[PDB]
Amino acid sequence: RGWFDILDDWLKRDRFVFVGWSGILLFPCAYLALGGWLTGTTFVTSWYTHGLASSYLEGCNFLTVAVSTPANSMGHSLLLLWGPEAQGDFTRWCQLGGLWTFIALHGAFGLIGFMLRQFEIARLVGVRPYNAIAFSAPIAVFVSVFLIYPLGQSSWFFAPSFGVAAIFRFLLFFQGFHNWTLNPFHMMGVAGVLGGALLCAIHGATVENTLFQDGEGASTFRAFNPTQAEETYSMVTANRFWSQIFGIAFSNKRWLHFFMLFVPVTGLWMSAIGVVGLALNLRSYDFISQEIRAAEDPEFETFYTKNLLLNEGIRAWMAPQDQPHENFVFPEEVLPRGNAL
Amino acid sequence: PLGISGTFNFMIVFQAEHNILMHPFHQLGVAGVFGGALFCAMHGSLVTSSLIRETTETESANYGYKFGQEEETYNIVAAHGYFGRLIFQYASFNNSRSLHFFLAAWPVVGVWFTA
Amino acid sequence: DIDGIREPVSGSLLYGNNIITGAVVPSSNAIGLHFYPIWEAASLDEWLYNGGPYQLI
Amino acid sequence: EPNPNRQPVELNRTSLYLGLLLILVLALLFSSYFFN
Amino acid sequence: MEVNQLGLIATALFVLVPSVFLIILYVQTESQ
């Protein structure tokens, strides 16, 4: 009955918000990630790192506020408040981009905290930890997109900024520079996400429309008792309906619910792998056989060549403003343009 | 267009001519499919976490369920007790019918909006 | 000729596409919203050029 | 002196169908990139 | 089209090798 055993008893006391040992990592970091985002989007500029306004105080709205990435000249600096760039000056820290690494790093450890919480709670209640295992895909996405991707590039500047419109800019950057829609790892991610939404909707609708009449009411929600032993819908009727509608159907409820875990989790993992490749500019940008043909045959045109022309427009029209540290000066005459527009 | 690269062309031109990323109905569609994928993983992992022991370790746990059996193969009370503690008690469903209606409604409504 | 400007886009595997780049191409902008069944075309060759399969599909 | 740790392995027909579908769709996906 | 000549064998083995694996396991499940 040492102090460790006593601290363990209090941490694991059953209260309204469970704490646990994992809480000591989780709660400070999550609160500070949250808090830093709300603080930066309300009060802090991106004027000296990006040449942009980015806070409510500057007149942005919920879609255009952001905690933006540090200037490219910071490289991959941790940007510690007490470090060589800000030298303990909080104001300068905000101006140089320190809230971005602040949120990214506290957020990283908060995510670790949350996964640890899933393990800790599962162990105490006596359930298998498949929910912790499922949470590895969001962690893979976050680590690959916010950390690995900028670490392979020139600086933190090219990571996603934390904001709605800033993430849309990120989307479009990845189209015009990486041809990311053409990447089979993203295609697998897309299939996993849309397949997960498909399964979500089809399983809920199927259960809602094969319920047993276990009550007299027209609202069927009151006819379920969480301690009842009986299945609340008919697996047998659901199976026959889908076999005759679609040709096949689930027959094993365990495989069904495992499959629901597997599909979106695997999708996010695949997309994470493609982003790691993009950290190094290892894109699936081109098809060589199409380029060889197209270069030789001015009559050969496909949707592949049409999209490259869009990518080229994106790159040249957005780069000067998007990468102000490069000092791109593009005269009008060099900008690619079709007729009239 | 009826094609993989053709679809992407359609999306890119759509953005240039309508700023669809900045349209709330598309933002609702993304919440719909992201959230759909989230809740798919959650429901799958929660029911899988609370499967009742019915098999040894040298066989698939899927054989713990027999097609047509009357009893449930997982302990929803245990899943609630886990998930209630992961967030807080009332952020968690204990009514399987309410839970499954939520699974149907969320992605359907979101895809309605983006359509 | 998807855009109606006599600039045909090659969409099929035999004409130099792969799985990722191939498509059934939308029907010509010259047609607009007009109905273009096979029997409105002077020939199948005309129908193919102007993207008749897309409407039928 | 047989080894007691040996076990039979199984793959039911549905798993065969699932797995064959995965391999074939993956092939159909990546083949364009292998040909480049 | 000037495609990679090794693309055919990569695709062919990519299909055949894992497929044959699954067939082997399935047929011996059925005969026992």
């Binding site: 040709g247 | - | 035999l14 792969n18 799985i19 | 549905t14 169908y17 | 055919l8």
Partner: peptide, 30 residues
């Protein structure tokens, strides 16, 4: 050869659909 490969793989998938539907393990109520 690449056209033939794409079409071959697609055709194998359609054959798999046929067996997966009409020659499934029948679901048995037991």
């Amino acid at each position: 050869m690449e056209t033939i490969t794409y079409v071959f793989i697609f055709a194998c998938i359609i054959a798999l659909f046929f067996f997966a539907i009409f020659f499934r393990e029948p679901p048995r109520i037991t």
